[PDB]
Design a protein around this ligand. Structure first.
Ligand SMILES: [Sr+2]
Ligand SMILES: [Sr+2]
Ligand SMILES: [Sr+2]
Ligand SMILES: [Sr+2]
Ligand SMILES: [Sr+2]
Lengths: 74, 72, 69, 77
């Protein structure tokens, strides 16, 4: 592959490439992980919002049903 | 004619430049990791409060029901 | 040599890209941290509210249980 | 002057060593990040499932509250 400018074609710089070979690949992974990470965050953020809307409807109805229930008690 | 040193110095500059970036990126991932891990703590709190609320609503229903039935 | 630090320059560029993606993810997770917090609250109020209706319901049932003797 | 071309040899050799080291550090650095990332996706996944259970429980309440509202009503005759 060759990630670097080779000078002393010695194995010491042969290890640099090997190393950069792996780093490059792992960055690829990191990119997709980041992308997926971002979309899950979005999707969930929206759901959370939805979840939240239902939470109100429910609490409202609950509190109201509560009011009734409370009057029928005294 | 050791211009070769020039190159080696350039490559070196490139390599440490990359390590620095891989550094920002590395911490960046550590932060997200710790951030959502922390948020998990907020989500399961929400999970139990809702589980509870569901239980209470269910109970409330069958009690209000038994109420209606006890009317006769 | 007939070899260069080109890919190294590419790798260096994608890394910085992922760095950008992750900065955006950060803003998103914080937007999430904000939302989760509100759900935490709305879930907390919800429990409280249902807890109260559970109570009303219980007493309500006890009323007619004994009203019927 | 030979004593200069001699410093350039050592200097260039030293830079390589450092460069080598730099790549060796990038390796674990990027390896750690991959682990933190997986762990995150994983955590994000199960947390996502918790939210699903949350939403469903929200739908349960919304439905159940229908009998509750009915029962109440049937009480005021
Ligand atoms: Sr930091
Ligand atoms: Sr509370
Ligand atoms: Sr209660
Ligand atoms: Sr592996
Ligand atoms: Sr989902």
């Amino acid at each position: 592959g060759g990630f670097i400018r080779r000078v002393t074609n010695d194995a010491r710089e042969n290890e640099m490439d090997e190393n950069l070979e792996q780093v490059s690949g792992i960055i690829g992974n990191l990119r997709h992980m980041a992308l997926d990470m971002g979309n899950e965050i979005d999707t969930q953020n929206r759901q959370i919002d939805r979840i939240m809307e239902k939470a109100d409807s429910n609490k409202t109805r609950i509190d109201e049903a509560n009011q009734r229930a409370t009057k029928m008690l005294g | 004619s050791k211009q070769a040193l020039s190159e080696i110095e350039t490559r070196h500059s490139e390599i440490i430049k990359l390590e620095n970036s891989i550094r920002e990126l590395h911490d960046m991932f550590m932060d997200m990791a710790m951030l959502v891990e922390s948020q998990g703590e907020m989500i399961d709190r929400i999970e139990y409060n809702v589980e509870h609320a569901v239980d209470y609503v269910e109970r409330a229903v069958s009690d209000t029901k038994k109420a209606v039935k006890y009317q006769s | 040599n007939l070899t260069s630090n080109r890919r190294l320059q590419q790798t260096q560029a994608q890394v910085d890209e992922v760095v950008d993606i992750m900065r955006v993810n950060v803003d998103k997770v914080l937007e999430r941290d904000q939302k989760l917090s509100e759900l935490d609250d709305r879930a907390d109020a919800l429990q409280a509210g249902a807890s109260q209706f559970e109570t009303s319901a219980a007493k309500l049932k006890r009323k007619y249980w004994w009203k019927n003797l | 002057m030979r004593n200069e071309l001699e410093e350039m040899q050592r200097r260039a050799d030293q830079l390589a060593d450092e460069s080598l080291e730099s790549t060796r550090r990038m390796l674990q650095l990027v390896e750690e990040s991959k682990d933190a990332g997986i762990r995150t996706l994983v955590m994000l996944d199960e947390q996502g499932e918790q939210l699903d259970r949350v939403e469903e429980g929200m739908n349960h309440i919304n439905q159940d509250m229908k009998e509750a509202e009915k029962n109440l009503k049937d009480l005021g005759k």
